[PDB]
Design an enzyme around this catalytic site. Structure first.
Site, short mmCIF file in Angstrom:
data_model
loop_
_atom_site.label_atom_id
_atom_site.label_comp_id
_atom_site.label_asym_id
_atom_site.label_seq_id
_atom_site.Cartn_x
_atom_site.Cartn_y
_atom_site.Cartn_z
N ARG A 97 31.75 -55.10 -55.07
CA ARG A 97 32.21 -54.39 -56.25
C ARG A 97 33.02 -55.36 -57.13
O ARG A 97 33.31 -56.50 -56.75
CB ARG A 97 33.07 -53.21 -55.85
CG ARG A 97 32.32 -52.03 -55.23
CD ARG A 97 33.31 -51.00 -54.60
NE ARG A 97 34.21 -50.38 -55.58
CZ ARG A 97 35.44 -49.92 -55.32
NH1 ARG A 97 35.96 -50.01 -54.10
NH2 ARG A 97 36.16 -49.39 -56.31
N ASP A 138 39.46 -54.97 -45.47
CA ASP A 138 39.70 -53.60 -45.88
C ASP A 138 38.35 -53.00 -46.23
O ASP A 138 38.26 -52.15 -47.08
CB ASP A 138 40.66 -53.57 -47.08
CG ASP A 138 41.15 -52.16 -47.40
OD1 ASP A 138 41.42 -51.36 -46.48
OD2 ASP A 138 41.28 -51.84 -48.59
N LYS A 169 41.69 -53.20 -41.02
CA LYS A 169 41.74 -51.77 -41.26
C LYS A 169 41.43 -51.12 -39.89
O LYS A 169 40.45 -51.47 -39.25
CB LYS A 169 40.63 -51.44 -42.25
CG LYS A 169 40.65 -50.08 -42.83
CD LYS A 169 39.35 -49.86 -43.53
CE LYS A 169 39.38 -48.63 -44.40
NZ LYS A 169 40.22 -48.88 -45.62
N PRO A 173 38.06 -43.31 -34.41
CA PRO A 173 37.15 -42.20 -34.71
C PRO A 173 37.73 -40.95 -34.04
O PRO A 173 38.49 -41.04 -33.08
CB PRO A 173 35.85 -42.66 -34.04
CG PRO A 173 35.91 -44.16 -34.17
CD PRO A 173 37.34 -44.44 -33.79
N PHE A 174 37.43 -39.78 -34.58
CA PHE A 174 37.98 -38.56 -34.01
C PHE A 174 37.32 -38.18 -32.71
O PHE A 174 36.10 -38.21 -32.62
CB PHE A 174 37.91 -37.46 -35.05
CG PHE A 174 38.59 -37.85 -36.31
CD1 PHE A 174 39.83 -38.49 -36.25
CD2 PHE A 174 37.96 -37.70 -37.53
CE1 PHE A 174 40.42 -38.98 -37.39
CE2 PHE A 174 38.55 -38.18 -38.68
CZ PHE A 174 39.79 -38.83 -38.61
N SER A 199 46.52 -39.11 -43.00
CA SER A 199 45.76 -40.25 -42.58
C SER A 199 46.16 -40.76 -41.19
O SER A 199 47.35 -40.82 -40.84
CB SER A 199 45.94 -41.36 -43.60
OG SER A 199 45.07 -42.44 -43.34
#
Ligand SMILES: Nc1ncnc2c1ncn2[C@@H]1O[C@H](CSCC[C@H](N)C(=O)O)[C@@H](O)[C@H]1O
Ligand SMILES: Nc1ncnc2c1ncn2[C@@H]1O[C@H](CSCC[C@H](N)C(=O)O)[C@@H](O)[C@H]1O
Ligand SMILES: C[n+]1cnc2[nH]cnc2c1N
Ligand SMILES: C[n+]1cnc2[nH]cnc2c1N
Lengths: 291, 291
Positions: A97, A138, A169, A173-174, A199
């Site tokens: 980007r 990141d 970063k 994971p849940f 978060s």
């Protein structure tokens, strides 16, 4: 009002002394209160990490490879802070980007428009050699599959680039979305003030000594733990007004920020740590256009 | 005759106190002198590794997953040694080739005809659970590309199986055939008596504490070092007659074997360590049909 008195804030994951069952209803709650809060979050965490490397004498003369850096608006403040301090650093910012144009026109910072892959990492390592590399990642693709994929890329960044230190970063994971146990680099799990309201993300800070690389397995039980500890931190802790915190803002995140800012080096000499922090914070907020 | 007096033999790579420029002409020299010498090599190294785990109380009740086990003739002796000692162990031998029929008919040893891959490792882990796993890998595809591929598979064996200890095949790629730096698990580099005449191969012995996994990078300079140290060990050291070694055979490899065998546990009580070693060696040679 939700008032409390604390000695110090939770700086790292392990310091969190309690946990709460996650309430899926919190996802529906306001995630941010400050404009450009994401940049603020990144700027503090990265000033903290880097000032530490300075303390250890490993910053000066290094090339900071920041992958997942765009727009990277806050990186202009970091760059200026250390440049005005006399520390010599080259910044190599890589993302597919586009970066904030405020980063252009600086001989010390190179902006690269490329999504990195293992092959590209190999060529930059060859080109950066023999310079000492500090890695900041990141990158963001999400699904647990996206996560694992990101974590798997970050581990390759370290093995190929072979940095002297790294900031990564890290968000587990849940548990209810577990896929498989995986390994992450060993480091300090730095907690982030101004992170979104609920978060579970932190930054994995690591310094590489010797030619060794220590990793650590992350299991589903570990994933349950992260969720409850971060849910307790977010719902309860971060919602506290620290009354014994004599500062213009007593909310937890400001109390937490203060502890990070007190570690930052400055040219200007100050009579008190409060004087320094107020200064750096004011400075940081003005730069970021945060009221 | 090439006579010398030594205190102890080189047990691990780091102990090698000298090096020699590799002479490519050594590849043309006789690689073996004893029949079934390869089985002997494997049997000593694996008896040594396993007796250590016994010493640390981690052998009993474990499942030994041996990948790259066929024919595995010598594994029958290991199996018998610990079975007759009263240690409870299940052996799971996996290879795509066929095993020595002497391994059949034992409820404690399972033979699997499968070439393992990351997926297969996942299913055996699920099926072996919750048993404690000890890993022994002796897989062989060779090119530096073959090697890296083997080493990359062995690292996945550890991360997926999550063993309490591991013995891995380790031979550094040759410097003049370097492809890229890679990581290997941290462990002791056990040297191997009866290895082929100019072999640079050793076994990487590791015990896993905590949930951590320590790796170590291997570079081309490291590859040069391995080559010169192992070339000195092979050409000079292993060619010595240790005269102050009162044993029926004074050649270095027998002096070296003695030190490995002295660590092995026995039911029979012996008046001297020499008595034990002579016994185990005789026993081992008879089993293997080595004169
Ligand atoms: N392989 C890859 N290489 C580089 N950038 C990547 C990447 N995969 C994702 N990204 C980038 O990861 C970024 C996540 S957001 C990054 C924000 C930035 N750190 C800042 O200070 O503002 C996105 O810009 C995305 O393009
Ligand atoms: N993925 C894989 N899984 C299992 N065995 C493998 C393998 N790749 C190679 N092998 C095996 O690795 C072996 C190398 S020789 C092994 C000798 C054995 N350890 C003994 O005691 O005699 C070969 O039998 C080969 O089939
Ligand atoms: C932040 N956050 C979001 N979604 C989830 N699902 C399970 N745990 C979480 C969590 N902590
Ligand atoms: C054993 N052996 C065989 N071929 C080589 N080529 C370079 N080094 C070696 C070595 N040690």
């Amino acid at each position: 009002m939700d008032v409390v008195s604390l000695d110090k804030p939770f700086m790292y994951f392990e310091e969190i002394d309690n946990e709460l069952d996650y309430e899926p209803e919190s996802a529906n709650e306001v995630a941010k209160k400050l404009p450009y809060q994401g940049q603020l979050k990144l700027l503090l965490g990265e000033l903290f990490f880097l000032s530490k490397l300075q303390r250890h004498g490993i910053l000066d003369g290094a090339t900071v490879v920041y992958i997942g850096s765009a727009p990277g608006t806050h990186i202009r403040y970091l760059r200026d802070h250390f440049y005005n301090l006399g520390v010599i650093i080259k910044w190599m910012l890589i993302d597919g980007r586009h970066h904030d144009p405020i980063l252009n026109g600086l001989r010390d910072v190179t902006l690269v428009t490329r999504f990195v892959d293992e092959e590209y990492l190999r060529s930059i390592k060859k080109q950066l050699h023999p310079s000492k590399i500090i890695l900041i990642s990141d990158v963001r693709s999400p699904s647990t599959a996206d996560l694992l994929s990101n974590y798997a890329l970050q581990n390759v960044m370290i093995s190929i680039l072979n940095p002297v230190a790294s900031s990564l970063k890290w968000r587990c994971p849940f548990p209810d979305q577990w896929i498989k146990d995986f390994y992450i680099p060993h480091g300090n799990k730095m907690l982030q003030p101004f992170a979104p309201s609920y978060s579970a993300e932190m930054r994995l800070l690591s310094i590489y000594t010797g030619e060794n690389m220590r990793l650590t397995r992350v299991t589903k039980s570990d994933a349950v733990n992260y969720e409850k500890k971060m849910y307790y931190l977010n719902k309860i802790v971060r919602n506290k007004v620290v009354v014994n915190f004599d500062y213009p803002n007593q909310e937890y995140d400001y109390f937490h920020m203060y502890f990070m800012l007190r570690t930052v080096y400055c040219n200007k000499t100050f009579p008190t740590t409060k004087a320094k922090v107020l200064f750096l914070q004011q400075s940081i907020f003005r730069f970021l256009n945060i009221p």
